[PDB]
């Protein structure tokens, strides 16, 4: 009440230092507060969402302001390939003369922006620093507006009722039509009015966007019916980005590949793409039922889906109420979808560079791919954790009888057993093949290793248009119906981009790719096994049938019944976090090595060294680590010294995580008791008395601290390694 | 340009703000 927690009298009454730790950890668990109600919970979440949107906008505004005030965007637009982007100025009192000179980029001490914001902003149409500054001001105003809205909605007069928060039909109809649809239509308008004209040497701004029309024919063709006039004259294929040489007037073309000069998707194709997407979204935004008496009811649709045979039981009868009354089920679904989308974003961005000149910037490409993939791993692991929380706290089997969800809980053992079998089969076989190749290669007999060609993946590549394998199926065969249908629309450009052999569109795959893809499979299956097992066994198990009665996160049940360490579902999530880091580490390792071999023009190294793990450790971790660990040495220092120091710092934080991950509470409790005795038994220091009794980190607190240390070290170590390697190798 | 703004803000946000925030936070948690 009057102590630090303020939301849990149980923690406020704790006389040890554990109260502050637990209060900080349980600060966002609104559902677990003492005086909490559904209406208050939803209102607090609404305000939190407003305050979070404001934080996101403030961050982006800060990036824009730093790039415009301290960056070199104006000097980078002229020669995007000769120069390098600048993130922000470096003002460190500890920098020595050598450090200052090493980090000097020509006029000031700054960092080389590796986030790829320069290419993005240059592609959308930004060409002046003043434009970036204005954008930052606008985003700051937007953040202030969202802050004001958040404070306004938490007031008693503007508090949204619970019924309004559960109006799924309207929320979906307004998010698919306006948040997703109108937003995409507006982006298309911007591209047609600013991005395309800016790319064609015609800078159009607020002062003249109402004066100059995007298309010479105006809007007359749109109202008449013949929209082809908007795709009549595309770029001449030799146009120079940012100039008017060989420019066209087509605003909505459907070319196939990337712009040859920028090796990025055509802006006209992007505008046409967003236009189609916006139309589809606005159309799909009218599906649900609102106050107009037209549409669908989510509950009716869910209840109408029930196989007559009864294989799925009572179908989705009751699923609607279960999802609507449970925020954790909603959060689990949203996190799962957002994770799949953020991983799809990385996979689609590397293969089809959307931003101009992004392909050349290898450092930014690798950093962004790894960035989104690691965030995707965290997002899917969080989705599974929230699903487990939903089973323990927001799931009542009484109301879910013979439901698809209830049936999932009924045969959970079969699901876990099959997932375990798949994970075991993949591990045994993938590691067996990797070590077999390693052993044979070690004995000087590389020809004896088992190299399985990825025939199925190569076939999908051929069906897409690849001709290296000579399958001649579908788009690879010019006589195919699909190829003939699109031969005059997008097939020529797309086939030129897929068969380039230099870009990352449908990269050539070999046995090494087959083996590592199987390893990727092993990791995905084992992580989902741990997470699915945690979610399904979250309510109970033969060892602890009353697990649901102890919540989602609890230390254990004591050494009784043989031992119950890590019995809680939270521990399943904590065990799956390590596997997610491993799986995503393998995925990023493979992407970075494949792309490093392609960029350097030596793919044979990967083709012949990825079959065995010795190569993965020598030609990738050891060979590429030379420029990273040489940032600073007795001879002097480099600009990569920061990356080397960060690499070592990450190694240290990772080991520190090992500390809490190995030693458990009990050794530290006694140690702290000994320290307490020492402090209260020494003169001149007895006056100082601890207000909170010192205590060792809790069992669960130790697992979370160790997992955070391990995670921070893993991410920071690979970030430093990838950035430093891709920099020194090509810089 | 305002080359003096970074020299006046970095020390404030790195030394003034953390110490002041920690002091206020310590008083709040203890009291």
């Amino acid at each position: 009440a009057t102590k630090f927690p303020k939301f849990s009298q149980a923690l406020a009454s704790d006389p040890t230092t554990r109260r502050i730790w637990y209060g900080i950890a349980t600060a966002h668990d609104f559902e677990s507060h003492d005086g909490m109600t559904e209406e208050n919970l939803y209102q607090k979440i609404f305000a939190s969402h407003f305050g979070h949107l404001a934080i996101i906008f403030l961050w982006t505004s800060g990036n824009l302001f730093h790039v415009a005030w301290q960056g070199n965007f104006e000097q980078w637009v002229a020669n995007p390939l000769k120069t390098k982007p600048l993130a922000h100025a470096i003002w460190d009192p500890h920098f020595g003369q050598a450090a200052l000179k090493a980090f000097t980029r020509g006029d000031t001490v700054a960092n080389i922006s590796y986030s790829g914001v320069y290419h993005w902003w240059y592609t959308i149409g930004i060409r002046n620093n003043v434009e970036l500054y204005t954008g930052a001001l606008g985003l700051l105003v937007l953040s202030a507006v969202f802050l004001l809205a958040g404070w306004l909605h938490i007031q008693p007069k503007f508090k949204p009722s619970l019924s309004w928060f559960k109006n799924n039909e309207s929320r979906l109809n307004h998010h698919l039509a306006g948040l997703f649809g109108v937003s995409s239509l507006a982006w298309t308008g911007h591209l047609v009015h600013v991005a395309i004209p800016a790319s064609r040497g015609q800078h159009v701004g607020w002062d003249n966007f109402i004066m100059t029309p995007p298309h010479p024919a105006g809007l007359q063709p749109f109202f008449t019916g013949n929209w082809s006039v908007y795709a009549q004259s595309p770029d001449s294929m030799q146009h120079v980005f940012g100039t008017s040489q060989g420019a066209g007037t087509a605003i909505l073309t459907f070319l196939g590949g990337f712009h040859p000069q920028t090796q990025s998707l055509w802006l006209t194709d992007m505008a046409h793409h967003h236009l189609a997407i916006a139309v589809i979204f606005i159309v799909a935004g009218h599906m649900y039922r609102t106050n107009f008496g037209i549409g669908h009811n989510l509950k009716t649709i869910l209840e109408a889906h029930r196989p007559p045979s009864g294989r799925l039981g009572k179908g989705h009868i009751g699923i609607y109420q279960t999802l609507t009354n449970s925020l954790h089920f909603q959060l689990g679904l949203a996190l799962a979808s957002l994770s799949v989308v953020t991983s799809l974003v990385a996979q689609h961005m590397y293969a089809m560079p959307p931003y101009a000149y992004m392909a050349f910037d290898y450092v930014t490409q690798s950093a962004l791919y790894t960035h989104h993939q690691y965030i995707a791993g965290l997002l899917i692991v969080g989705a599974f954790a929230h699903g487990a929380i939903f089973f323990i706290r927001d799931y009542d089997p009484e109301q879910n009888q013979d439901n698809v969800l209830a049936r999932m809980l009924a045969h959970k053992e079969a699901v876990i057993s099959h997932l375990s079998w798949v994970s075991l089969f993949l591990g045994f076989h993938t590691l067996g093949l990797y070590v077999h190749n390693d052993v044979v290669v070690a004995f000087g007999n590389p020809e004896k290793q088992i190299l399985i060609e990825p025939i199925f993946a190569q076939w999908i590549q051929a069906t897409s248009g690849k001709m290296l394998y000579g399958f001649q199926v579908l788009l690879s065969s010019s006589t195919s119906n699909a190829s003939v249908a699109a031969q005059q629309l997008w097939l020529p450009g797309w086939l030129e981009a897929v068969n380039n052999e230099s870009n990352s569109l449908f990269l050539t795959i070999g046995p090494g790719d087959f083996l590592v893809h199987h390893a990727i499979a092993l990791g995905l299956h084992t992580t989902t096994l741990i997470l699915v097992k945690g979610a399904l066994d979250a309510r109970g198990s033969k060892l602890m049938p009353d697990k649901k009665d102890f919540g989602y996160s609890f230390p254990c049940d004591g050494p009784g019944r043989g031992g119950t360490c890590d019995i809680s579902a939270w521990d399943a999530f904590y065990l799956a976090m390590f596997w997610m880091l491993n799986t995503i580490g393998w995925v990023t390792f493979y992407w970075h090595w494949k792309h490093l071999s392609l960029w350097q023009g030596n793919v044979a190294q990967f083709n012949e060294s990825s079959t065995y793990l010795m190569g993965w450790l020598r030609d990738y971790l050891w060979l590429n680590s030379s420029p990273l660990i040489n940032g600073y040495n007795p001879y002097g220092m480099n600009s990569l010294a920061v990356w080397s120091w960060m690499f070592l710092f990450a190694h240290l934080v990772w080991a520190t995580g090992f500390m809490f991950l190995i030693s458990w509470r009990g050794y530290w409790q006694e140690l702290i008791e000994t320290l307490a005795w020492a402090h209260e038994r020494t003169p001149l220091a007895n006056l100082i008395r601890w207000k909170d009794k010192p205590v060792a980190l809790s069992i669960v607190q130790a697992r979370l601290v160790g997992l955070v240390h391990f995670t921070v070290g893993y991410i920071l170590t690979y970030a430093a390694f990838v950035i430093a390697s891709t920099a020194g190798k090509f810089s | 340009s305002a080359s003096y703004l970074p020299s006046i803000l970095v020390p404030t946000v790195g030394l003034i703000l953390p110490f002041a925030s920690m002091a206020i936070l310590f008083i709040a948690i203890e009291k």
Partner: peptide
């Protein structure tokens, strides 16, 4: 970006901070 422009941005940031301090204290 002129010095005056940076100062204007700082003033707006201060306003945003005040709003975000009010929003948090209300919560």
């Amino acid at each position: 970006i002129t010095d005056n422009q940076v100062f204007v941005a700082l003033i707006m940031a201060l306003v945003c901070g005040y709003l975000a301090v009010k929003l948090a204290k209300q919560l």
